[PDB]
Amino acid sequence: PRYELALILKAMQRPETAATLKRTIEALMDRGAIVRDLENLGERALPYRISAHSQQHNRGGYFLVDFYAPTAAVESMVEHLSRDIDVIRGNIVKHPLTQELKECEGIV
Amino acid sequence: AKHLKFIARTVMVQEGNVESAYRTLNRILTMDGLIEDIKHRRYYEKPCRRRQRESYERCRRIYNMEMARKINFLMRKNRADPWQGC
Amino acid sequence: KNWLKKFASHARLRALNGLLYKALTDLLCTPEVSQELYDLNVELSKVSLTPDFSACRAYWKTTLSAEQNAHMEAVLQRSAAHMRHLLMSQQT
Amino acid sequence: REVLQLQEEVKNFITRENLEARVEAALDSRKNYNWAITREGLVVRP
Amino acid sequence: NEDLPISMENPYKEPLKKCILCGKHVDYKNVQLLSQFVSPFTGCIYGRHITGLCGKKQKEITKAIKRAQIMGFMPVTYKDPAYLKDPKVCNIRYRE
Amino acid sequence: RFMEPYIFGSRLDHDIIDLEQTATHLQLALNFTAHMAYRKGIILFISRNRQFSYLIENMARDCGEYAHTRYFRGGMLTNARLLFGPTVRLPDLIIFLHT
Amino acid sequence: YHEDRIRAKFYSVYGSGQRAFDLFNPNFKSTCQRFVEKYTELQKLGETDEEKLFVETGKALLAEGVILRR
Amino acid sequence: TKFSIYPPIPGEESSLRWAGKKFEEIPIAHIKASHNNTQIQVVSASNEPLAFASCGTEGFRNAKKGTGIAAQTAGIAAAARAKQKGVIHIRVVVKGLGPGRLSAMHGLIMGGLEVISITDNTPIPHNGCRPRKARKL
Amino acid sequence: KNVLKIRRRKMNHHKYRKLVKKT
RNA sequence: AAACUCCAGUUGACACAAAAUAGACUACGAAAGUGGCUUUAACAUAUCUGAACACACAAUAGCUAAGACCCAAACUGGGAUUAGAUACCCCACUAUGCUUAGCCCUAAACCUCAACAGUUAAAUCAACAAAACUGCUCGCCAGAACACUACGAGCCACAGCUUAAAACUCAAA
Ligand code: FES
Ligand SMILES: [Mg+2]
Ligand SMILES: [Mg+2]
Ligand SMILES: [Mg+2]
Ligand SMILES: [Mg+2]
Ligand SMILES: [Mg+2]
Ligand SMILES: [Mg+2]
Ligand SMILES: [Mg+2]
Ligand SMILES: [Mg+2]
Ligand SMILES: [Mg+2]
Ligand SMILES: [Mg+2]
Fold first, then answer.
1. CA H3, H6, H8, H11 torsion: positive or negative?
2. What are the domain boundaries of chain H?
3. Under DSSP, is residue F14 helix (H, G, I), strand (E, B) or coil?
4. Which residue ranges have their beta carbon within 6 Å of ligand 1?
5. Which long-range contacts (CB under 8 A, 24 or more apart) does F86-89 make?
6. Does the A2-98 domain belong in CATH 3.30.70.60?
7. CB B54 within 8 A of CB C85
8. SS3 labels along G4-56
9. Domain parsing of chain A, residue ranges
10. How far is the CA of H129 from the centre of ligand 6 (A)?
11. How far apart (Å, rounded) are the C-alpha atoms in residues A104 and E23?
12. Alpha-helical regions (H) of chain B
């Protein structure tokens, strides 16, 4: 189905961020994914302090990866994100656009 | 513990009015339910007792709202008698 | 429970007195009961329980003004039931 | 119409060839999902 | 006789009232919108008696807020100060 | 419920009383009243609507009949012998302007 | 009644007439009632397309000289 | 300029200053108001403990310790010991709903310190540990 | 409802449980 | 009063535990139950009824094994009170509450309303509960107590569960 990967990456310089993004997308493709688009939400202060890989983070880069993947890929990809040291936090959700916007007639 | 400090539940003082700021903080903590949470968490409330209490409070609020609406609707008739004598 | 019908239709004593004094003071310390009660700054002197535990008399210090005393008395009497409910809900 | 839309959409998917260029372009871009609502039910964009 | 009333649906029927978010998509990434329904001082989610939202959109906002908070998009214990100057849509006053 | 057969319809949640039936009912009522008055029967108007107590009393006095627009004490009719006397005569017809 | 539909549209487009109702007059004629009568006449002497009837009725009433602010 | 009840953001530059210092540089008075005791500690913005005074360290014992007067005395003493270290402005952070929640702040004000902001940091678990059973008194 | 039947059930059960413990 | 002072306060690091606010919502599931986030499976039946035992399930408590252990806590110690207090109050700490794999099969397991279909007309209708009924099916009931008992039988249960009497007694319950 269609999934969205919300990625909070280590606050790094441009070459390292580019390498990390390429590595993540390559993992997605290796797991059978068709990557649709990559969106950069920007570098920002984290809402709270996040401890990952024996390091404390207060700032991070927010990215979105839209893709289509088989259902078996997701779990595998999750494990991969657990091992990547440049990933503060990764989450794969069902793509919000795929969710249907049922119409409402108002308050009864 | 992991959040930024001096933003949550923080009040600034205006022209050295410390008491007004403290009372505003008390108002905020009560309106957000934090005071009630802290007081209720001193001892364990059993799930059945919790359910009964919430049911009672919901029904009491509904009943009070309906009674208030009834009185406000019937207060319109409360005026000076227009047919005095007859 | 069909609440609509219901709505429509001695050493120990000293310990309880002290406990209820502390509890009622701490309830009056905040707007937990109501903002109108909080703004009054009602101070309690003592709590006395009748020997048969049929009533809890909470003695509140009066002020010098008379209209303030009457307003305080009105608010307190109007808020007694909610205070009782809170005291049992907090399991004091 | 579903198939035609998907056909024209696939032309802008990230393949193994454009991965570097697309990553750089995304690094040189910013997307904003934030927007607020008013009491009248109107959207105010950032 | 032509003057008799005719069977008909009420033509003066007023449209059913709609919540402020009716017809609009609520996303966990739109932290600006989600922050309009939490307490500025504690970050607690407002009830529907305050937000005025219908049940469906109240549930949508609650789920989006929890998702954003756990995924590292939104703070938990306070409203992000960047959104303190947004339009006020909730019927609550702290007399602040 | 028992007033439904007499209702023409409901115009924007406001009932409309069918006047074609009102005409026949009023004809029968007025005929009965006229016949009772011809027979020299006692006619007692009753109404607790205070907006019209004065008007009803004036009308009753004018037509030489009787009115009761005031509080109805228990037993005017069922206990009339104790409350008026052993030989009181009760009304032959009562007209409710407000029931 | 049929004209209720027309009335509804009127009260939604031109709003409540600034002229006040006089219910004591048994033959009172509102702006909405004039619009209804003109609409019925245009329907009976012409075709049946509701929107065209609406605009034609508005034009005819404005020609008569009654103000109708949308 | 409209007074803002919300605190300044350390990131966003603001013009509010106290003795030339910013909000994030003022010392902090941490008050812990327990049910039987009140403990005040003044620390720097860099977490250097300057002064410390509780109701117990000021001689009060047992039930007298959990009173408003005891908290006032502790606040006065903490304010004195902090005044001996160059503190005039403080940001207050109270933790707990004990009797000395406000009396300790009163004592701090009466000892010479100026309060610019009040914060509440009472622990509220989102259902973590289970509390003890209610008393059968 | 008759609470005495519930009380009698309580007494009989408690009396029964004592006997099995004893013997 | 005991207890601790390897105590207490700020800061930082940090769960196999339970899940503020939303929820003033009343949703899901056969019921029991289910209220932190994500993802994958996934919520039978295009007549109805149909079982103490057949086939699957069943809160809490409890029993076997291994594991985890913050907090709470039957028991067990200490402190205080009391005429006595090994209860109530304070402190400490177990089985247990948690995970895995097996058992046990009980609740005011209650909406104290058996499942499906239909009606609102009648006299509405002992009472109260929760407006009164009709058709059809299954289950169950024929005074109280003896009795959630005895015996028999079945059961991973062995002070256990299901089924469940009679004798004596009474004019009531
Ligand atoms: S009223 Fe339509 S979505 Fe809320
Ligand atoms: Mg079946
Ligand atoms: Mg059978
Ligand atoms: Mg059974
Ligand atoms: Mg079980
Ligand atoms: Mg243990
Ligand atoms: Mg029940
Ligand atoms: Mg059945
Ligand atoms: Mg049993
Ligand atoms: Mg046997
Ligand atoms: Mg047995």
1. negative
2. 1-137
3. strand
4. A 104, 106-107; E 18-19, 22, 54, 56-57
5. F89/F42
6. yes
7. no
8. HHHHHHHHHHCCCCCCCCCCCCCCCCCHHHHHHHHHHHHHHCCCCCHHHHHHH
9. 2-98
10. 15
11. 7
12. 18-31, 34-40, 47-74
